[PDB]
Amino acid sequence: SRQAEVNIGMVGHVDHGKTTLTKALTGVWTDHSEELRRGITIKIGFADAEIRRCPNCGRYSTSPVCPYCGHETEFVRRVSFIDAPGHEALMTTMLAGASLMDGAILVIAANEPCPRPQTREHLMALQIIGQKNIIIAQNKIELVDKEKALENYRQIKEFIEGTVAENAPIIPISALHGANIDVLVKAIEDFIPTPKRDPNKPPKMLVLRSFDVNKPGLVGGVLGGSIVQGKLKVGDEIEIRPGVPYEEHGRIKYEPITTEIVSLQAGGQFVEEAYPGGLVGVGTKLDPYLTKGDLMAGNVVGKPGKLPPVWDSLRLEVHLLERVVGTEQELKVEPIKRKEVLLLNVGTARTMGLVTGLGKDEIEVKLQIPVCAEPGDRVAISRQIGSRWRLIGYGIIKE
């Protein structure tokens, strides 16, 4: 298996070199329709990269040809970089789907004095989800002098003290010129090693997309998602929850569906077995009508009888965010009131929630759409402040 082994979050303002850096790492330079593979509940995108090492000079890179001496490099490990369109999307992705991230690269521009508001929230989110496999990329060093670079470095050290990023390496880089990229890649190997996963645990996949690949104007329905536990294998019998909607006595219910895995695609190739890391394509025997147009997006996949429960309503222990990004009042966040209709994101699932009850640092919400989740799972909570959805906190599913 040559598929991605870890998902690495590209956490940084959408303009501190973050894009230039991601492309430098993935080697993708052609103007990118994987934009059609991105999530539509949480807008997470994946971009694989193969970490390789040069036998001649020993330096690491993500190219088959060493950028430093021109010799052929040796394969080390494939990884996948995950990102989202803009600050709000990224924050929601981290709070709702921490299990999709194994480490992160915090991009900080040395070109800028004090730690920016977005950067402050980025670290706030990493702290909340307990993601400690962090690497700090001090980008754009080619735009500032030697002294301001060292000053920025000091500010960063003070910024990370006492946080999940305290022990993270700070790597001065120039994504544009390619300076110190080899140091960053090796750091990915040293600080974001592949976790020691128990491949025997019950499989679980969070479905991001679903389609009818039948070429028209035949193949079973196809699912696209992330394996967060165990492994999947061609021929396995799988169950999908909540499942297909159906009406019963003027009410909408969901029937879990069981099917069989016909094929698996990961790392750009068909495989007989897939694991956590990167996007995984799942060919099934399902009637294509059931997966067409992302009907299964947000669903959870596992083996029959071994999936998390389905909830029609949730009791959430709520933690409101003390945000720093937004207009003057958008930061005040008024307490949650009964009858409010909130936007909830859990895993890759997305549903509106009507607040029907309140408790101490707790709310009870009736869901528009049932969700498949485990007690203890984290749920991002958003409020429609005007005409847009703004993240205001997160909840922990209570039993």
User: Which is nearer to Zn ion, 61 or 291 (by Cβ)?
Assistant: 61
CA distance 205 to 183: 33
User: Which is nearer to Zn ion, 40 or 65 (by Cβ)?
Assistant: 65
Rg (CA), the chain: 22
Q: What is the DSSP pairing of strand 251-266 with strand 237-248?
A: antiparallel
Q: Is 175 annotated as a binding residue?
A: yes
- Could you tell me the smallest distance in angstroms from the CB atom of residue 55 to Zn ion? 8
- Could you tell me the smallest distance in angstroms from the CB atom of residue 179 to Zn ion? 16
Q: CA of 225: how far to CAs of 72, 103, 146, 299, in Å?
A: 33, 19, 44, 10
User: Which is nearer to Zn ion, 56 or 327 (by Cβ)?
Assistant: 56
- Could you tell me the smallest distance in angstroms from the CB atom of residue 203 to Zn ion? 40
In the chain, % helix, strand, coil (3-state, to 5) comes to: 20, 40, 40
Do 108 and 12 touch, CB atoms closer than 8 A?
A: yes
User: Which is nearer to Zn ion, 13 or 186 (by Cβ)?
Assistant: 186
Task: List all residues 6 or more positions away from 225 whose beta carbon is below 8 Å from its beta carbon.
Answer: 205, 206, 207, 208, 209, 279, 280, 282, 301, 348
User: Which is nearer to Zn ion, 61 or 133 (by Cβ)?
Assistant: 61
Q: Is 54 annotated as a binding residue?
A: yes
Q: Is 62 annotated as a binding residue?
A: no
Hey, is 63 helix, strand or coil?
Answer: coil
User: Which is nearer to Zn ion, 71 or 157 (by Cβ)?
Assistant: 71
- Could you tell me the smallest distance in angstroms from the CB atom of residue 186 to Zn ion? 13
- Could you tell me the smallest distance in angstroms from the CB atom of residue 155 to Zn ion? 34
Q: Is 16 annotated as a binding residue?
A: yes
Q: Is 387 annotated as a binding residue?
A: no
Q: Is 66 annotated as a binding residue?
A: yes
Q: Return the structure tokens found at 376.
A: 């203890």
User: Which is nearer to Zn ion, 56 or 269 (by Cβ)?
Assistant: 56
Sort residue 134 into left (φ over 0), alpha (ψ -120 to 50) or beta: beta
Q: Using the structure block, give the residue that is written with the tokens 């297909």.
A: 244
* Interface with Zn ion (CB under 5 A): 54, 56-57, 66, 68-69, 71
Q: Is 176 annotated as a binding residue?
A: yes
Q: Return the structure tokens found at 198.
A: 């128990």
Which residues share a beta bridge with 47?
81
Q: Is 26 annotated as a binding residue?
A: no
- Could you tell me the smallest distance in angstroms from the CB atom of residue 74 to Zn ion? 10
CA distance 344 to 333: 17
- Could you tell me the smallest distance in angstroms from the CB atom of residue 61 to Zn ion? 8
Residue numbers belonging to the annotated binding site for Zn(2+): 54, 57, 66, 69
List the binding residues.
15-20, 39, 41, 54, 57, 66, 69, 139-142, 174-176
